Amino acid sequence: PEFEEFNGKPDSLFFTDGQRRIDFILVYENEKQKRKRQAYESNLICHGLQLEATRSVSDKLVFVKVHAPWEVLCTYAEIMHSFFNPATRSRIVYFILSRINRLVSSGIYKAAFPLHDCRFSERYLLYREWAHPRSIYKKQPLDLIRKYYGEKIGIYFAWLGYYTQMLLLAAVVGVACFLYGYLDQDNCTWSKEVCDPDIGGQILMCPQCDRLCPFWRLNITCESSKKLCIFDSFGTLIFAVFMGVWVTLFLEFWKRRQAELEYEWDTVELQIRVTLCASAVFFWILLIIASVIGIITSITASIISAIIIMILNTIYEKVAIMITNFELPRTQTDYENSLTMKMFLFQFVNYYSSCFYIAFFKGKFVGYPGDPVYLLGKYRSEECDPGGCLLELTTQLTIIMGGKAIWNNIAEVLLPWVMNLIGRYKKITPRWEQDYHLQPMGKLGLFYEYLEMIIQFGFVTLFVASFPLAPLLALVNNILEIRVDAWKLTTQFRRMVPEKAQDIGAWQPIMQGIAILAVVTNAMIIAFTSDMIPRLVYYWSFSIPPYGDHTYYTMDGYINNTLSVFNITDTLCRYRDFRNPPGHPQEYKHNIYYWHVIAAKLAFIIVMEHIIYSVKFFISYAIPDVSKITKSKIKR
Amino acid sequence: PEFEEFNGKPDSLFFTDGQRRIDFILVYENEKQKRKRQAYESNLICHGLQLEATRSVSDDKLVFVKVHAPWEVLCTYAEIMHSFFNPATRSRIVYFILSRINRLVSSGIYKAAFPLHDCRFSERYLLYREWAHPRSIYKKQPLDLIRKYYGEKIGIYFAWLGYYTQMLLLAAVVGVACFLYGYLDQDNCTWSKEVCDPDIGGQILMCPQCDRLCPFWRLNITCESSKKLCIFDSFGTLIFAVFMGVWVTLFLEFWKRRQAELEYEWDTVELQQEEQARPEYEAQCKCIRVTLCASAVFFWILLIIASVIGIIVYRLSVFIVFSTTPQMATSITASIISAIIIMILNTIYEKVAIMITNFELPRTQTDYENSLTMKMFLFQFVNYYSSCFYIAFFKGKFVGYPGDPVYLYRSEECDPGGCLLELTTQLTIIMGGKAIWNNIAEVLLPWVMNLIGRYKRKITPRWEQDYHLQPMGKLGLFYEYLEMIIQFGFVTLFVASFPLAPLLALVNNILEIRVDAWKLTTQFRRMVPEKAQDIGAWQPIMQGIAILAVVTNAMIIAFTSDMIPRLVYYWSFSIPPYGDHTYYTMDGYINNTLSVFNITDFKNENPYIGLGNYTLCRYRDFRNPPGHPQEYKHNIYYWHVIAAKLAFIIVMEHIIYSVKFFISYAIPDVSKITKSKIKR
Ligand SMILES: [Ca+2]
Ligand SMILES: [Ca+2]
Ligand SMILES: [Ca+2]
Ligand SMILES: [Ca+2]
Ligand SMILES: [Ca+2]
Ligand SMILES: [Ca+2]
């Protein structure tokens, strides 16, 4: 019932009078809608908040600024247990309005948001010094961003930076291991003997399809094998072990950082059907696993992958929102945890189903060219690429991390920017006005940034047994990522209602599960996917006299016998299996070597799982989750 | 001190005037110490406590000091720490006042201290009639009553032992079920019935185990053991091992549910004030000493390992004289000897560990408890499970073949059906001996000390009737917890051997809860109440045991239990390209697997020709038989088998770990009724 229009002040941090402060904005643009809106406004007035409705220069849309006086905000802060910064004021006013999401969900109320500082006073400082591209190198003023945006976004950015630093450590170690593998390429006997036309040229390997792809010569595989040997060497072993250790150190030191930030910022604040739903979600998960597996220069492929992942992500968001309400406990925290879990599961499938397929599905469920697996009209489950499943996984992971990360950040800046541009399309205006035209932060928007980084963490840790440059790629990605997120939140997206975050959130159990699954997955990649264990077993057994023709053990002769002599009966070929060349009473069957092979690597897998989990337990035991200095300031 | 003696009323917890009750007892019996003691007496006078000092009739030097607190003092100290004041509350308040006594008692000026009993064996009389008694062995425990009498930690220990007993009930029932399945299928054990078949079992010519004076013992001598061996490694045992993983999972979650229930019920969660330093720690006001202390532990760890190696040497030395089946008696005697040596070394390490932890400096008593827990649990783990891990995972594993056999010297071999029979014998011996002898000792030792104290030397008062009993000590139920954790390790870590492991163990627990209870009311004194919401460091330990158990169990089934070789035969070698049977069956297993050995031994001796006149003997290994281009050597079979076992380990580990994760995640650590009561 109050209206006053004034756009004369461009940098109006206050109302028309200037005494009050902007603590929120609600936009108002049938008769029963008007009655309900008036009832809510009267309730708001009775709570004590001071409201002011104004008409924009460009009419029909009316902005309703609000300002909770000092007494009411002080009382509500006491409920949670100029003096207060605008972040806390916005959070308090939003909590008051909550007892507003239901209103804005329907068409009765359009939108509401806290007001920013100014254009590009604190946003100017944290834009030029922190958010502007001119200041990429310098670290973020964590206290300043905590002051402005909030504790939840602050914890997100602090976690992002810490994860970047730990990525830098793992990345320098990965670069060391990568160069150790790369320099030792001329001494790689297998690569050279494959490259030899006398050996490599004569030997032949089996076709992937049924008379579609013909027989090919090892020359292409000889050329591709050098990169495989670069990514298939004991440097990969040492880096996988180091990554098993580094995940533990990462998690533990982040526990320490969480504790220290909890002390510094007082983040700790307080205020049958299930079985059927689980069965349905498992069915959907396997369905989309099948979808992605069936789905499966560099810039175009990366863009295509990004678009596919985007549309699939939209589908997952739709289906998860549809299915969550059936088991909704009418609890926002429980609902958001369930949505986090379901969206993460859909994304986990969408991203890592192809990777798991490359690792442990190509060449595994394919029988010998005599009677392979035939399921339906679709036939002959495709064999692994002759270059190497490790090579394919490294290619796919590099594509995903690098290209999809740069494209995701380009989208993260442009899409809000272009939406803001087309909104402004629809002269001087107050700096509190344009924040309406630019898009509001979506529901659980920061959940998406957290999910993106959790997906990157999964790519880096889960599949690090392939190539050690994944931490480096994710390091540069994080360096860009933190600043693009800062820029979009500073400029494109209006101010988000500050939250309180004791930790990052539901992604912590996700990260722990990813750590355990990453240990087991790295072990099974090294053994099952990479042929290093059969390489070593051939070396050590079939190179010493009892099984080999060499006086001292040497890997020579491995190539002449890794090809299982073949006669085509549904000249010689070999698929992904150590089989029995003719001369045995049974041929095309699990060979003497093959049991050596599986026993060796899965015994290596047992050893590695046990030692890595032992080291993780020892680290969690030895390394406290609370720092010494944190205890010293706690006892103060 | 108002020192005056009057035995008078034989059973009266009140003063000479009788107006006020009594909570505690301090016994004592020079000038500087006499000056110092009366100073603290004046300190308690300023603290308001009331103490009655009596010059006991039996010894004129002995003086008892009965301790009580006035109601105002009780109220203000109840304010300090978070018939109205129950005797347990009075005891806790009194000792908190005394602590705010450790140094004076340690210094020897005050001889001892304890909390009073009601009467002879009236809370104590009721607690001895319907509880703490062999006749009442089949009645539920008055847990709230023993909480009001003894204290919080005592209550939680007895609750934990009862809950362990309950869970072992179902564990033992399922174990008996699988054991019955194996016993029933014993009639159709093709390999064992083949062993006891003179046509095939009588033609088994197994190679000698030792070089000197050991014949080629045929399978006939072990036929009867084979009868009870097919039961030990049968698919029912495997199913029970999986169920044991499940029950291990179910155990601790419901325990912590019950523990939170008791936290709400007894209001265990109270003011955890800063702990007082131990008197010995403050007497002398460290990293090198700690590292030196750790070195002492690991040196003795090798010592018991060396004692275990002596058992290995003993079996090697004593089999020949037994031979002149002998190996069964040898194993039984060796297991008895190992149990005796474990019991002997247990007390030795108890004393030396108390001394060692005295040597190092814990800043608080709970730090002492944690360090002692770690050292004691480590040593007792090594003690009890060293022989068991040896039999399960070392004995017979690395013997090679008759040509160039392994030397150290000449490590032990094992029977065709594995050493799960010997491990079963060792486990049964250890656990049954633990029950019978350990519990008899648990009763007698405090009773024996009571008897010898009485012989030192009729109307006697409560304080005289109770001081002439062994004080419990500041540790207390540490050792019964350790005993039950050792039993848990035996039951779960080793359950792949015999499913009846809980059953007899169940027996123990029942008997256990009474014998201990007996000594806590009859033989020993009453122990001072302590506050302890949880059983403490033992709970993480069990978790580790749980995490260990799965692995161990899988390994025992894969490595120790020979079931995997038989499944490998039954699904891969009955085929005509590998055997002769048209379909899948287990017959021919023994004739097929254990390859022969023609007598061509390496000269690195050759006692085979000296000790017999046989041509080809059959060893229990899959290596190459004669006619092979590289004979007496590994073949396809052994690596097939080892891949089967390791893959079984991986499958069982991952499946069982997944199931444990699912159960812990699905079943919350807080009960719905518990949360409802908390909300109300
Ligand atoms: Ca990105
Ligand atoms: Ca982002
Ligand atoms: Ca820690
Ligand atoms: Ca006992
Ligand atoms: Ca006992
Ligand atoms: Ca649980």
Author numbering:
A (entry chain B): 50 to 78, 91 to 119, 121 to 143, 202 to 219, 233 to 253, 264 to 414, 451 to 475, 509 to 638, ...
B (entry chain A): 50 to 78, 91 to 143, 202 to 219, 233 to 253, 264 to 427, 449 to 487, 504 to 587, 591 to 639, ...
Question: What do the authors say?
Answer:
The pronounced coupling energy of 1.4 kJ mol−1 obtained in a double mutant cycle in the background of the strongly left-shifted F518H illustrates a strong interaction between both residues in the active state of the mutant protein. To probe whether this interaction would trap the protein in an intermediate state by preventing a further separation of α-helices 4 and 6 to fully open the subunit cavity, we have determined the structure of the double mutant F518A/Q623A by cryo-EM. In this double mutant, the truncation of both side chains precludes an equivalent polar interaction as observed in F518H and would thus permit a relaxation of a potentially strained conformation. However, the structure of this double mutant does not resemble the open cavity of nhTMEM16 and instead shows very similar properties as observed in the mutant N562A, with two predominant channel populations. One of these populations is symmetric with both subunits residing in a Ca2+-bound inactive state, the other is asymmetric with one subunit showing an inactive and the other an activated state. Their similar size indicates an open probability of about 30%, which is somewhat higher than observed for N562A. The conformation of the activated subunit strongly resembles its equivalent in N562A, except for a small movement of α4 resulting from the removal of two bulky side chains, and there is no hint of a further opening of the cavity, which provides another piece of evidence for conformational differences in the activated conformations of TMEM16F and nhTMEM16. Remarkably, we find a similar arrangement in the corresponding structures of the activating mutants N526ACa, which concerns a residue that is neither located in the α4-α6 interface nor lining the pore and the double mutant F518A_Q623A, where both side chains forming a strong polar interaction in Ca2+-bound states of F518H are truncated.
